[PDB]
Amino acid sequence: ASAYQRFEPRAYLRNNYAPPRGDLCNPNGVGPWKLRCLAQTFATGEVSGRTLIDIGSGPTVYQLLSACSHFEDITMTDFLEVNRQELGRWLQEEPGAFNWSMYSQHACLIEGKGECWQDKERQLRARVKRVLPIDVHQPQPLGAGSPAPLPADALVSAFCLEAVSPDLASFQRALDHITTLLRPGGHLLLIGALEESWYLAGEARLTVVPVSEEEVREALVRSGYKVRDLRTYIMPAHLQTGVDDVKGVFFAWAQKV
Amino acid sequence: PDSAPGQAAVASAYQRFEPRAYLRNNYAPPRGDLCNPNGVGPWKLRCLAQTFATGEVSGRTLIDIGSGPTVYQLLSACSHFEDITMTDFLEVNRQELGRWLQEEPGAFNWSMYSQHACLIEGKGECWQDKERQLRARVKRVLPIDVHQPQPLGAGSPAPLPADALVSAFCLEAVSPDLASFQRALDHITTLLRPGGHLLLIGALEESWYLAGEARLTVVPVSEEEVREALVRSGYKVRDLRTYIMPAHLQTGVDDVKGVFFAWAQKVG
Ligand SMILES: Nc1ncnc2c1ncn2[C@@H]1O[C@H](CSCC[C@H](N)C(=O)O)[C@@H](O)[C@H]1O
Ligand SMILES: Nc1ncnc2c1ncn2[C@@H]1O[C@H](CSCC[C@H](N)C(=O)O)[C@@H](O)[C@H]1O
Ligand SMILES: Cn1c(N)nc2ccccc21
Ligand SMILES: Cn1c(N)nc2ccccc21
């Protein structure tokens, strides 16, 4: 964890959400694939309710772009103060906020409701009620007296669990911890890196547990979920850039039984 | 009657036309707000998109008539024509297009329109690709006077005859009266091949608009007058739609009551 104290949000954003990984023009790219997974899942109309919590949001909002129109109360979270501040800058439209508009545009494009990207962002900013500290290693990841409405009707989390866990076991426990935040019959949308061991965020060099699709499937099962959907994106050569060693990205739609 | 005087007044008035003021008056918010699906921006784009989506309007060459400083009218068209000719009476408008073509920062920003076109075309295209294709496909930007029997002049560079014509807010805005309008329509029709298509957008019952210092006269026309002119010019009218300007889009930049869209096909 101490490694995360060197984590630079801007370097992370630049490494993963600016070209080439952040060019959304190519439909075969990872950015479009992720947004498409999220969009399609919400378009089924089976993931719904009043409140949602995003786990380990970091400095990113793309993971909620499709979500925000299904949940009137959204709580975003991260372990790091610097990440929560970077979120603030975007949520409050403060100077030097990250430009997510390519992702907003592409989400509007994929969803196919003819919505302008500005309305999309407006709705996201309006529904994100609070940004809270979190530690998925604690049995109560949000603390004891959290301002967050619990239990949530739905969880989202992207690139967090594998990226903060030393090994499979710690990964499984983290999953158990966040699962307690979710109402029975509720939904989890989980995005993660496949077979990754490290990545860079400026001066920070972080350790990642290398996990497979079957390992992810089994963990979800062991945590008491029914796996509704589990998809893999194999990382093409051109998006393997020296900022990490990720091999693929997985998307899992799980329902707490 | 005699047309020269009226046409001379038009030419004179346009010497004060200010492209930036025009762009801001008509293509920046609220008229340029593409978020409201009931707004005039989305309606125009939809009309053009849907028309091209029939697949009935294709060919190799397209001529946009009186482009002015705008490109929105070509956003859906550019997927269907490899060779596009843009045109305008005013050099300053052609320069404005020059800026956009060169992708200069000082150029007007059409990205809201590009994105929206991509949104309704429903092909998952990013707006940067839409724009890159339009820039690639614009082969020339030429002077034009619709009041001349040969609007492009004698021996123009443009591929003639064209397979398709586009024209937005030009004819009525440069014609002193309906007779002049009809002649202008007759003139541009000589540029279209038999069997080719005209997509025409225009103001209904407009008599004036502002472009900075310039205040310009417009012949007020109705939908029925437009239909009859198209028939009179040798077209079969395939589609003619009317958009009624809502009060909140009537901003004192003009006295437009509505916008027409016409899809017409030249007989032959
Ligand atoms: N012990 C812990 N508990 C919960 N989140 C943690 C954590 N240690 C680090 N994090 C956060 O986990 C994130 C991994 S990076 C991914 C962030 C974002 N959700 C994405 O999709 O890009 C970082 O924001 C990091 O600060
Ligand atoms: N005699 C003439 N022949 C052809 N175009 C003319 C003309 N006199 C003025 N114009 C052009 O007619 C245009 C009307 S404004 C409309 C411009 C653009 N097509 C749009 O949709 O906004 C101006 O650009 C003006 O310069
Ligand atoms: C590992 N990883 C993170 N943390 N963000 C990403 C975006 C695209 C591809 C891989 C990514
Ligand atoms: C008359 N007119 C022009 N010339 N451009 C317009 C855009 C929207 C609505 C009306 C318009």
Coordinates of C-alpha atoms and ligand atoms in Angstrom, one line a residue:
Chain A
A1 CA 0.0 0.0 0.0
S2 CA 2.8 2.4 0.9
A3 CA 3.6 2.3 -2.9
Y4 CA 0.3 4.1 -3.5
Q5 CA 1.6 7.2 -1.7
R6 CA 3.7 8.0 -4.8
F7 CA 0.8 7.5 -7.2
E8 CA 0.4 10.5 -9.5
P9 CA -3.2 10.8 -10.9
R10 CA -2.1 12.9 -14.0
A11 CA 0.5 10.3 -15.0
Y12 CA -2.0 7.5 -14.5
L13 CA -4.6 9.3 -16.6
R14 CA -2.1 10.0 -19.3
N15 CA -0.8 6.4 -19.3
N16 CA -4.3 4.8 -19.7
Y17 CA -6.8 7.3 -20.9
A18 CA -4.9 9.4 -23.5
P19 CA -3.9 8.0 -26.9
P20 CA -3.4 5.4 -27.9
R21 CA -5.4 3.7 -25.2
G22 CA -7.6 6.7 -25.0
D23 CA -8.3 7.2 -28.7
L24 CA -11.9 6.1 -29.1
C25 CA -12.1 6.4 -32.9
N26 CA -11.0 2.8 -33.5
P27 CA -13.9 0.5 -32.6
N28 CA -11.5 -2.4 -31.9
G29 CA -9.7 -0.4 -29.2
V30 CA -10.0 -1.1 -25.5
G31 CA -11.8 2.1 -24.6
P32 CA -14.8 1.4 -26.9
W33 CA -14.8 -2.3 -25.7
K34 CA -15.2 -1.2 -22.0
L35 CA -17.9 1.4 -22.7
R36 CA -19.7 -1.1 -24.9
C37 CA -19.7 -3.7 -22.1
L38 CA -21.1 -1.2 -19.6
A39 CA -23.7 0.2 -22.0
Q40 CA -25.0 -3.2 -23.2
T41 CA -25.3 -4.4 -19.6
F42 CA -27.4 -1.4 -18.6
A43 CA -29.5 -1.5 -21.7
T44 CA -30.9 -4.9 -20.6
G45 CA -32.8 -2.9 -17.9
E46 CA -32.0 -5.6 -15.3
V47 CA -29.5 -3.5 -13.5
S48 CA -31.5 -0.8 -11.7
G49 CA -32.3 0.8 -8.4
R50 CA -31.8 4.0 -6.5
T51 CA -28.2 3.9 -5.3
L52 CA -24.8 2.9 -6.6
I53 CA -21.3 2.8 -5.3
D54 CA -18.2 3.0 -7.5
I55 CA -15.2 1.2 -5.8
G56 CA -11.7 2.5 -6.2
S57 CA -12.8 5.2 -8.7
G58 CA -9.3 6.6 -8.9
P59 CA -9.3 9.8 -11.0
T60 CA -11.7 8.4 -13.6
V61 CA -15.4 8.7 -14.4
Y62 CA -15.7 6.7 -17.7
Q63 CA -16.9 3.7 -15.7
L64 CA -20.1 5.5 -14.7
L65 CA -21.1 7.1 -18.0
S66 CA -23.8 4.6 -18.9
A67 CA -24.5 3.9 -15.2
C68 CA -25.5 7.4 -14.3
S69 CA -28.9 7.3 -16.0
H70 CA -30.1 4.3 -14.0
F71 CA -29.0 5.5 -10.5
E72 CA -30.1 8.7 -8.9
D73 CA -27.6 8.5 -6.0
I74 CA -24.0 7.7 -6.8
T75 CA -21.1 7.4 -4.4
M76 CA -17.6 7.5 -5.8
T77 CA -14.6 6.3 -3.8
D78 CA -10.9 6.0 -3.6
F79 CA -8.1 5.2 -1.1
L80 CA -6.0 8.3 -2.1
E81 CA -6.8 11.9 -1.3
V82 CA -5.1 13.0 -4.5
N83 CA -7.5 10.9 -6.5
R84 CA -10.5 12.3 -4.7
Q85 CA -9.3 15.8 -5.5
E86 CA -8.8 15.0 -9.2
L87 CA -12.4 13.8 -9.2
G88 CA -13.5 17.0 -7.5
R89 CA -11.8 19.1 -10.2
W90 CA -13.9 17.3 -12.9
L91 CA -17.1 17.1 -10.9
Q92 CA -17.0 20.8 -10.1
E93 CA -15.6 21.8 -13.5
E94 CA -12.6 23.4 -11.9
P95 CA -9.5 24.5 -13.8
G96 CA -7.2 21.7 -15.2
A97 CA -9.8 19.0 -14.9
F98 CA -9.3 16.0 -17.0
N99 CA -11.1 16.1 -20.4
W100 CA -13.4 13.0 -20.5
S101 CA -15.5 14.3 -23.3
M102 CA -14.2 11.8 -25.9
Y103 CA -15.5 9.1 -23.6
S104 CA -18.8 10.9 -22.9
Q105 CA -19.3 11.4 -26.6
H106 CA -18.5 7.7 -27.3
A107 CA -20.9 6.6 -24.5
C108 CA -23.7 8.7 -26.1
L109 CA -22.8 7.2 -29.5
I110 CA -23.0 3.6 -28.2
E111 CA -26.1 4.1 -26.2
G112 CA -28.0 5.3 -29.2
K113 CA -30.5 7.6 -27.5
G114 CA -29.4 10.6 -29.4
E115 CA -28.2 12.3 -26.2
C116 CA -25.6 15.0 -26.5
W117 CA -22.4 14.4 -24.5
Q118 CA -22.9 17.6 -22.4
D119 CA -26.2 16.3 -21.1
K120 CA -24.6 13.0 -20.3
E121 CA -21.9 14.7 -18.2
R122 CA -24.4 17.0 -16.6
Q123 CA -26.4 14.0 -15.4
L124 CA -23.3 12.3 -14.1
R125 CA -22.1 15.3 -12.2
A126 CA -25.6 15.8 -10.8
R127 CA -26.1 12.2 -9.6
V128 CA -22.7 11.8 -8.0
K129 CA -23.7 12.8 -4.5
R130 CA -20.4 12.2 -2.6
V131 CA -16.8 11.2 -3.0
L132 CA -15.6 9.0 0.0
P133 CA -12.3 7.5 1.2
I134 CA -12.2 3.7 1.0
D135 CA -10.0 0.7 1.8
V136 CA -11.2 -2.6 0.4
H137 CA -8.8 -4.5 2.8
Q138 CA -11.0 -3.4 5.7
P139 CA -14.1 -5.6 6.5
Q140 CA -16.1 -2.4 6.3
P141 CA -14.4 -0.8 3.3
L142 CA -16.2 2.5 3.8
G143 CA -15.7 2.7 7.6
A144 CA -18.4 2.5 10.3
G145 CA -20.5 5.6 10.0
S146 CA -20.4 6.2 6.2
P147 CA -22.5 9.0 4.6
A148 CA -23.2 6.4 1.9
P149 CA -26.7 4.8 1.7
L150 CA -26.2 1.1 2.5
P151 CA -26.7 -1.4 1.2
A152 CA -26.3 -0.2 -2.4
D153 CA -28.5 -1.5 -5.1
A154 CA -25.4 -1.9 -7.3
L155 CA -21.6 -1.8 -7.3
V156 CA -19.2 -0.9 -10.0
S157 CA -15.4 -1.2 -9.8
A158 CA -12.7 -1.0 -12.4
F159 CA -9.0 -1.9 -12.2
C160 CA -9.0 -1.8 -8.4
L161 CA -9.1 -5.2 -6.7
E162 CA -6.3 -6.9 -8.6
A163 CA -4.3 -3.7 -8.5
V164 CA -4.3 -3.4 -4.6
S165 CA -4.0 -7.2 -3.8
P166 CA -0.7 -9.0 -3.3
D167 CA -2.1 -12.4 -4.3
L168 CA -5.2 -14.3 -5.2
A169 CA -6.2 -14.8 -1.6
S170 CA -6.0 -11.1 -0.7
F171 CA -7.9 -10.4 -3.9
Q172 CA -10.7 -12.8 -2.9
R173 CA -11.0 -11.2 0.6
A174 CA -11.2 -7.7 -0.9
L175 CA -14.0 -9.0 -3.0
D176 CA -15.7 -10.3 0.1
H177 CA -15.3 -7.0 1.8
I178 CA -16.9 -5.0 -1.0
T179 CA -19.6 -7.6 -1.4
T180 CA -20.9 -6.7 2.1
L181 CA -21.8 -3.3 0.7
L182 CA -24.2 -4.8 -1.8
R183 CA -27.8 -5.6 -1.2
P184 CA -28.9 -9.2 -1.8
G185 CA -30.1 -9.5 -5.4
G186 CA -28.0 -6.5 -6.3
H187 CA -25.6 -6.2 -9.2
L188 CA -21.8 -5.9 -9.5
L189 CA -20.1 -4.7 -12.6
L190 CA -16.4 -5.4 -12.4
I191 CA -13.7 -4.5 -14.8
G192 CA -10.1 -5.6 -14.3
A193 CA -6.8 -6.3 -15.8
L194 CA -5.9 -9.9 -16.8
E195 CA -2.5 -11.4 -16.1
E196 CA -1.0 -8.0 -15.1
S197 CA 1.8 -7.8 -12.5
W198 CA 2.8 -4.1 -12.5
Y199 CA 2.0 -0.7 -13.8
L200 CA 3.4 2.8 -13.5
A201 CA 1.9 6.0 -12.2
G202 CA 4.6 8.6 -12.5
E203 CA 7.1 7.9 -9.8
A204 CA 4.9 5.2 -8.3
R205 CA 5.5 1.6 -9.5
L206 CA 2.6 -0.6 -8.3
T207 CA 2.4 -4.4 -7.9
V208 CA -0.6 -6.2 -9.4
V209 CA -1.7 -9.8 -8.9
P210 CA -1.8 -11.6 -12.2
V211 CA -5.3 -13.1 -12.5
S212 CA -7.1 -15.2 -15.2
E213 CA -10.7 -15.3 -16.3
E214 CA -11.3 -18.6 -14.6
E215 CA -9.8 -17.2 -11.4
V216 CA -12.1 -14.2 -11.6
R217 CA -15.1 -16.4 -12.3
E218 CA -14.3 -18.7 -9.3
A219 CA -13.8 -15.7 -7.0
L220 CA -17.2 -14.2 -7.9
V221 CA -18.7 -17.6 -7.2
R222 CA -17.0 -18.0 -3.9
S223 CA -18.2 -14.5 -2.8
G224 CA -21.8 -15.6 -3.4
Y225 CA -22.4 -14.2 -6.9
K226 CA -24.1 -15.7 -9.9
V227 CA -22.0 -14.8 -13.0
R228 CA -24.5 -13.4 -15.5
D229 CA -21.7 -12.3 -17.9
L230 CA -17.9 -12.6 -18.2
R231 CA -16.0 -11.3 -21.2
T232 CA -12.4 -10.9 -22.2
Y233 CA -10.6 -8.3 -24.3
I234 CA -7.2 -9.4 -25.5
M235 CA -4.8 -6.5 -25.5
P236 CA -3.5 -5.8 -29.0
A237 CA 0.2 -5.0 -29.6
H238 CA -0.3 -1.3 -30.3
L239 CA -1.9 -0.8 -26.9
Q240 CA 1.0 -2.5 -25.0
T241 CA 2.9 0.7 -24.3
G242 CA 5.5 0.3 -21.5
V243 CA 3.2 1.7 -18.8
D244 CA 2.4 -1.8 -17.6
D245 CA 2.2 -5.5 -18.7
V246 CA -1.5 -6.0 -18.8
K247 CA -2.4 -8.9 -21.2
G248 CA -6.2 -8.5 -21.3
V249 CA -9.1 -6.8 -19.8
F250 CA -12.1 -8.6 -18.3
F251 CA -15.6 -7.5 -17.8
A252 CA -17.8 -9.3 -15.3
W253 CA -21.5 -8.8 -14.7
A254 CA -22.3 -10.5 -11.4
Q255 CA -25.5 -10.7 -9.3
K256 CA -25.4 -11.2 -5.5
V257 CA -27.7 -14.1 -4.7
Chain B
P1 CA -39.1 42.7 -65.8
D2 CA -35.5 43.9 -65.2
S3 CA -33.4 41.9 -62.7
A4 CA -30.1 43.9 -62.7
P5 CA -31.1 46.5 -60.2
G6 CA -32.4 44.1 -57.5
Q7 CA -29.4 41.9 -58.0
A8 CA -27.2 45.0 -57.7
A9 CA -28.8 45.8 -54.3
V10 CA -28.1 42.3 -53.2
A11 CA -24.5 42.4 -54.2
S12 CA -24.1 45.7 -52.5
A13 CA -25.7 44.7 -49.3
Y14 CA -23.5 41.5 -49.1
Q15 CA -20.3 43.6 -49.2
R16 CA -21.0 44.2 -45.5
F17 CA -21.7 40.5 -44.6
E18 CA -19.6 39.5 -41.6
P19 CA -19.0 35.7 -41.5
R20 CA -18.2 35.5 -37.8
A21 CA -21.3 37.4 -36.8
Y22 CA -23.3 35.2 -39.2
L23 CA -21.8 32.0 -37.7
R24 CA -22.5 33.2 -34.1
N25 CA -26.1 34.3 -34.9
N26 CA -27.1 31.0 -36.5
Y27 CA -24.7 28.2 -35.5
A28 CA -23.8 29.0 -31.9
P29 CA -26.3 28.6 -29.0
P30 CA -29.2 28.7 -28.8
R31 CA -29.7 27.8 -32.4
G32 CA -26.4 26.0 -32.4
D33 CA -27.4 24.0 -29.3
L34 CA -27.7 20.4 -30.5
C35 CA -28.7 19.1 -27.1
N36 CA -32.4 19.7 -27.5
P37 CA -33.8 17.2 -30.0
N38 CA -36.6 19.6 -30.8
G39 CA -34.2 22.4 -31.9
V40 CA -33.6 23.4 -35.5
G41 CA -30.0 22.2 -35.5
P42 CA -30.9 18.5 -34.9
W43 CA -33.9 18.8 -37.3
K44 CA -31.8 19.9 -40.2
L45 CA -29.1 17.3 -39.5
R46 CA -31.8 14.6 -39.2
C47 CA -33.4 15.6 -42.5
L48 CA -30.1 15.3 -44.3
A49 CA -29.0 12.0 -42.5
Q50 CA -32.3 10.3 -43.1
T51 CA -32.3 11.3 -46.7
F52 CA -28.8 9.8 -47.3
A53 CA -29.7 6.7 -45.3
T54 CA -32.2 5.8 -48.1
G55 CA -29.2 5.1 -50.3
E56 CA -31.1 6.7 -53.1
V57 CA -28.9 9.8 -53.2
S58 CA -25.4 8.8 -54.4
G59 CA -23.0 9.3 -57.2
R60 CA -19.4 10.6 -57.6
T61 CA -19.8 14.4 -57.6
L62 CA -21.6 16.8 -55.4
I63 CA -21.9 20.6 -55.5
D64 CA -22.9 22.7 -52.5
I65 CA -24.5 25.9 -53.6
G66 CA -23.8 29.1 -51.6
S67 CA -22.0 27.3 -48.8
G68 CA -21.1 30.5 -47.1
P69 CA -18.9 29.9 -44.1
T70 CA -20.7 26.7 -43.0
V71 CA -20.1 22.9 -43.5
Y72 CA -22.8 21.3 -41.4
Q73 CA -24.9 20.9 -44.5
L74 CA -22.3 18.4 -45.9
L75 CA -21.7 16.3 -42.8
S76 CA -23.9 13.3 -43.9
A77 CA -23.3 13.9 -47.6
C78 CA -19.6 13.3 -47.4
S79 CA -20.0 9.5 -46.9
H80 CA -21.7 9.3 -50.3
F81 CA -19.7 11.6 -52.6
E82 CA -16.0 11.3 -53.4
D83 CA -15.8 14.7 -55.0
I84 CA -17.3 17.7 -53.3
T85 CA -17.4 21.3 -54.7
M86 CA -18.2 24.1 -52.2
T87 CA -19.0 27.6 -53.4
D88 CA -19.7 31.1 -52.4
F89 CA -20.3 34.7 -53.7
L90 CA -18.1 36.2 -51.0
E91 CA -14.3 35.8 -51.0
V92 CA -14.4 36.3 -47.2
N93 CA -16.7 33.2 -46.8
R94 CA -14.4 31.2 -49.0
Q95 CA -11.5 32.2 -46.8
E96 CA -13.5 31.2 -43.7
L97 CA -13.9 27.7 -45.3
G98 CA -10.2 27.9 -46.1
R99 CA -9.5 28.2 -42.4
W100 CA -11.5 25.1 -41.5
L101 CA -10.1 23.1 -44.4
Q102 CA -6.6 23.9 -43.1
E103 CA -7.8 22.8 -39.7
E104 CA -6.6 26.1 -38.1
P105 CA -7.5 26.8 -34.5
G106 CA -8.8 30.2 -35.5
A107 CA -11.4 28.4 -37.6
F108 CA -15.0 28.1 -36.6
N109 CA -15.6 25.0 -34.5
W110 CA -18.1 22.6 -36.1
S111 CA -17.4 19.7 -33.7
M112 CA -20.8 19.9 -32.0
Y113 CA -22.4 19.4 -35.4
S114 CA -20.0 16.7 -36.4
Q115 CA -20.6 14.7 -33.2
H116 CA -24.3 15.1 -33.6
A117 CA -24.2 13.9 -37.2
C118 CA -22.3 10.8 -36.1
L119 CA -24.8 10.3 -33.3
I120 CA -27.8 10.2 -35.6
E121 CA -26.1 8.3 -38.5
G122 CA -25.7 5.5 -35.9
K123 CA -22.5 4.0 -37.4
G124 CA -20.3 4.4 -34.3
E125 CA -18.1 6.9 -36.2
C126 CA -16.1 9.4 -34.2
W127 CA -16.5 13.0 -35.2
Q128 CA -12.8 13.3 -35.9
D129 CA -13.1 10.8 -38.7
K130 CA -16.3 12.5 -40.1
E131 CA -14.4 15.8 -40.3
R132 CA -11.3 14.2 -41.8
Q133 CA -13.4 12.7 -44.6
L134 CA -15.2 15.9 -45.3
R135 CA -11.9 17.7 -45.6
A136 CA -10.5 15.0 -47.9
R137 CA -13.6 15.1 -50.1
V138 CA -13.8 18.9 -50.6
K139 CA -11.9 19.1 -53.9
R140 CA -12.4 22.8 -54.6
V141 CA -14.0 26.0 -53.2
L142 CA -15.3 28.3 -56.0
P143 CA -16.9 31.7 -56.6
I144 CA -20.6 31.4 -57.6
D145 CA -23.4 33.8 -58.6
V146 CA -26.8 32.0 -58.9
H147 CA -28.2 35.0 -60.8
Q148 CA -26.0 34.1 -63.8
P149 CA -27.2 31.6 -66.4
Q150 CA -23.9 29.9 -65.7
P151 CA -23.6 30.3 -61.9
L152 CA -20.0 29.0 -61.9
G153 CA -18.9 30.9 -65.0
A154 CA -17.8 29.6 -68.4
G155 CA -15.5 26.6 -68.3
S156 CA -15.4 26.2 -64.5
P157 CA -13.2 23.6 -62.8
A158 CA -16.2 21.8 -61.4
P159 CA -17.1 18.4 -62.6
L160 CA -20.2 19.0 -64.7
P161 CA -22.9 17.9 -64.5
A162 CA -23.0 17.0 -60.8
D163 CA -24.8 14.0 -59.6
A164 CA -26.2 15.9 -56.6
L165 CA -26.8 19.5 -55.3
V166 CA -27.0 20.7 -51.8
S167 CA -28.0 24.2 -50.9
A168 CA -28.9 25.8 -47.5
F169 CA -30.3 29.2 -47.0
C170 CA -29.0 30.6 -50.2
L171 CA -31.6 31.2 -52.9
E172 CA -34.2 33.1 -50.8
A173 CA -31.4 35.0 -49.0
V174 CA -30.1 36.5 -52.3
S175 CA -33.3 36.9 -54.4
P176 CA -35.2 40.2 -54.2
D177 CA -38.4 38.5 -55.1
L178 CA -40.0 35.1 -56.0
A179 CA -39.4 35.6 -59.8
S180 CA -35.7 36.0 -59.1
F181 CA -35.7 33.0 -56.8
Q182 CA -37.3 30.9 -59.5
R183 CA -34.6 32.1 -62.0
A184 CA -31.8 31.3 -59.5
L185 CA -33.3 27.8 -59.1
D186 CA -33.4 27.4 -62.9
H187 CA -29.8 28.5 -63.1
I188 CA -28.4 26.0 -60.6
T189 CA -30.5 23.2 -62.0
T190 CA -28.3 23.4 -65.2
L191 CA -25.5 22.1 -63.0
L192 CA -27.4 18.9 -62.0
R193 CA -27.5 15.9 -64.2
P194 CA -30.9 14.5 -65.3
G195 CA -32.0 12.0 -62.7
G196 CA -29.8 13.7 -60.1
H197 CA -31.0 14.9 -56.6
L198 CA -31.2 18.4 -55.0
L199 CA -31.3 18.8 -51.3
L200 CA -32.6 22.2 -50.4
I201 CA -32.8 23.8 -47.0
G202 CA -34.2 27.3 -46.5
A203 CA -36.1 29.9 -44.5
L204 CA -39.9 30.3 -44.6
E205 CA -41.4 33.8 -44.5
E206 CA -38.2 35.5 -43.8
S207 CA -37.6 39.1 -44.9
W208 CA -34.4 40.1 -43.2
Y209 CA -31.4 38.9 -41.2
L210 CA -28.3 40.4 -39.6
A211 CA -24.7 39.6 -40.3
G212 CA -22.9 42.1 -38.2
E213 CA -23.2 45.6 -39.6
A214 CA -24.9 44.2 -42.7
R215 CA -28.7 43.9 -42.6
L216 CA -29.8 41.7 -45.5
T217 CA -33.1 41.4 -47.4
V218 CA -34.8 38.1 -48.0
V219 CA -37.8 37.2 -50.1
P220 CA -40.4 35.7 -47.8
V221 CA -41.5 32.4 -49.3
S222 CA -43.9 29.7 -48.2
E223 CA -43.8 25.9 -48.5
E224 CA -46.2 26.0 -51.4
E225 CA -44.2 28.6 -53.3
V226 CA -41.1 26.4 -52.8
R227 CA -42.9 23.3 -54.1
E228 CA -44.2 25.1 -57.1
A229 CA -40.7 26.5 -58.0
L230 CA -39.2 23.0 -57.8
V231 CA -42.0 21.6 -60.1
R232 CA -41.5 24.7 -62.4
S233 CA -37.8 23.9 -62.6
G234 CA -38.2 20.3 -63.7
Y235 CA -38.1 18.4 -60.4
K236 CA -40.2 15.7 -58.9
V237 CA -40.6 16.7 -55.2
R238 CA -39.7 13.5 -53.2
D239 CA -39.9 15.2 -49.8
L240 CA -40.7 18.6 -48.4
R241 CA -40.8 19.1 -44.7
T242 CA -41.4 22.2 -42.5
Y243 CA -39.9 23.1 -39.2
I244 CA -41.7 25.7 -37.2
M245 CA -39.3 28.0 -35.4
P246 CA -40.1 28.0 -31.6
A247 CA -40.2 31.5 -30.0
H248 CA -36.9 30.8 -28.0
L249 CA -35.0 30.3 -31.3
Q250 CA -36.3 33.5 -32.7
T251 CA -33.6 35.7 -31.3
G252 CA -33.9 39.0 -33.2
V253 CA -31.1 38.0 -35.7
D254 CA -33.8 37.7 -38.3
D255 CA -37.6 37.2 -38.8
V256 CA -37.6 33.6 -39.9
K257 CA -40.8 31.8 -39.2
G258 CA -39.7 28.3 -40.2
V259 CA -37.3 26.2 -42.1
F260 CA -38.1 24.0 -45.1
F261 CA -36.2 20.9 -46.3
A262 CA -36.7 19.7 -49.8
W263 CA -35.5 16.5 -51.4
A264 CA -36.1 16.9 -55.2
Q265 CA -35.1 14.8 -58.1
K266 CA -34.4 16.3 -61.5
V267 CA -36.6 14.9 -64.3
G268 CA -35.0 12.9 -67.1
Ligands
LIG1 N1 -6.3 -0.4 -0.1 C1 -7.2 0.2 -1.1 N2 -8.6 0.0 -1.0 C2 -9.5 0.6 -2.1 N3 -8.9 1.3 -3.2 C3 -7.5 1.4 -3.3 C4 -6.6 0.9 -2.3 N4 -5.2 1.2 -2.6 C5 -5.2 1.9 -3.9 N5 -6.6 2.1 -4.3 C6 -7.1 2.7 -5.5 O1 -7.3 1.7 -6.5 C7 -7.1 2.3 -7.8 C8 -6.5 1.4 -8.9 S1 -6.4 2.3 -10.5 C9 -8.1 2.2 -11.3 C10 -8.9 3.5 -11.0 C11 -10.2 3.6 -11.8 N6 -11.3 2.9 -11.2 C12 -9.9 3.0 -13.2 O2 -10.8 2.5 -13.8 O3 -8.9 3.6 -14.0 C13 -6.3 3.6 -7.6 O4 -7.2 4.7 -7.7 C14 -5.9 3.4 -6.1 O5 -5.6 4.6 -5.4
LIG2 N1 -25.6 36.2 -56.1 C1 -25.2 35.0 -55.3 N2 -25.0 33.7 -55.9 C2 -24.7 32.5 -55.0 N3 -24.5 32.7 -53.5 C3 -24.6 34.1 -53.0 C4 -25.0 35.2 -53.8 N4 -25.1 36.4 -53.0 C5 -24.8 36.0 -51.6 N5 -24.5 34.6 -51.6 C6 -24.2 33.8 -50.4 O1 -25.5 33.3 -49.9 C7 -25.2 32.9 -48.6 C8 -26.5 33.0 -47.7 S1 -26.2 32.5 -46.0 C9 -26.2 30.7 -46.0 C10 -24.8 30.1 -46.0 C11 -24.7 28.6 -45.7 N6 -25.1 27.8 -46.9 C12 -25.6 28.2 -44.5 O2 -26.3 27.3 -44.6 O3 -25.6 29.0 -43.4 C13 -24.0 33.8 -48.1 O4 -22.9 32.9 -47.9 C14 -23.8 34.7 -49.3 O5 -22.5 35.1 -49.4
LIG3 C1 -4.7 -1.8 -16.6 N1 -5.4 -0.6 -17.1 C2 -5.9 0.4 -16.3 N2 -5.7 0.6 -14.9 N3 -6.7 1.3 -17.1 C3 -6.6 0.8 -18.4 C4 -7.2 1.3 -19.6 C5 -7.0 0.6 -20.9 C6 -6.3 -0.7 -20.8 C7 -5.7 -1.1 -19.6 C8 -5.9 -0.4 -18.4
LIG4 C1 -32.3 31.6 -41.6 N1 -31.2 30.7 -41.1 C2 -29.9 30.7 -41.6 N2 -29.4 31.5 -42.6 N3 -29.2 29.7 -40.7 C3 -30.1 29.2 -39.8 C4 -29.9 28.2 -38.8 C5 -31.0 27.9 -37.9 C6 -32.3 28.5 -38.2 C7 -32.5 29.5 -39.2 C8 -31.3 29.8 -40.0

